[PDB]
Amino acid sequence: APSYRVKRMDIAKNDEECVVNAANPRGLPGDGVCKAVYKKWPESFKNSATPVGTAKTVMCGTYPVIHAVGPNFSNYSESEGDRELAAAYREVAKEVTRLGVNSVAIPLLSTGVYSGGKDRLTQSLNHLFTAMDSTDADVVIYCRDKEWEKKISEAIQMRT
Numbered sequence: 528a529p530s531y532r533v534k535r536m537d538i539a540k541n542d543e544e545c546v547v548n549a550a551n552p553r554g555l556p557g558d559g560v561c562k563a564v565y566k567k568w569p570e571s572f573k574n575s576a577t578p579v580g581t582a583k584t585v586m587c588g589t590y591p592v593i594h595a596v597g598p599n600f601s602n603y604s605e606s607e608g609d610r611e612l613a614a615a616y617r618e619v620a621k622e623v624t625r626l627g628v629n630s631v632a633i634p635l636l637s638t639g640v641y642s643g644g645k646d647r648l649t650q651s652l653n654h655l656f657t658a659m660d661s662t663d664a665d666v667v668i669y670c671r672d673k674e675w676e677k678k679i680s681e682a683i684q685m686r687t
């Protein structure tokens with residue numbers, strides 16, 4: 528019985544068998560959130576570069592870090608941006624399946640400084656759902672805002 532859950536906490540303190548890093552295509556560490564993923568799994572950033580709309584797994588010991596590069600909507604068109612966001616989540620599902628993990632910690636891609644200053648909770652979450660709905664892994668979504676936690680919780684509830 529694989530479930531969706533949401534937790535308002537630092538993804539770097541996840542209790543899942545792998546994590547998804549909200550990554551840049553340069554495989555570079557970044558600030559804010561990514562700075563805490565880097566600090567907890569720094570050697571996961573060795574050759575972690577992957578193009579926009581792709582995912583790449585780097586092992587930190589035996590702990591898989593899935594570098595998922597959602598589009599920067601500042602740079603992309605709404606329609607291509609949407610295409611790239613869907614693709615990234617699809618590659619995450621592929622990686623989660625290939626790794627054979629029973630659970631994954633995943634943020635909402637392209638909802639922070641890649642959002643183009645827009646609210647993409649529903650857009651990002653629905654693409655997450657489309658991709659992960661075909662996997663048998665428990666999915667734990669990580670956010671920081673209070674409301675977002677609630678809106679994500681409700682969206683999970685009203686599919687079951």
Ligand SMILES: O=C(O)c1nc(=O)[nH]c2c1CCCC2
Pocket residue numbers: 549550551557561595596597598635636637638639640641642
């Ligand atoms: O806006 C986001 O949450 C986001 N989604 C990504 O897929 N990648 C990255 C970010 C922000 C930090 C830089 C990399």
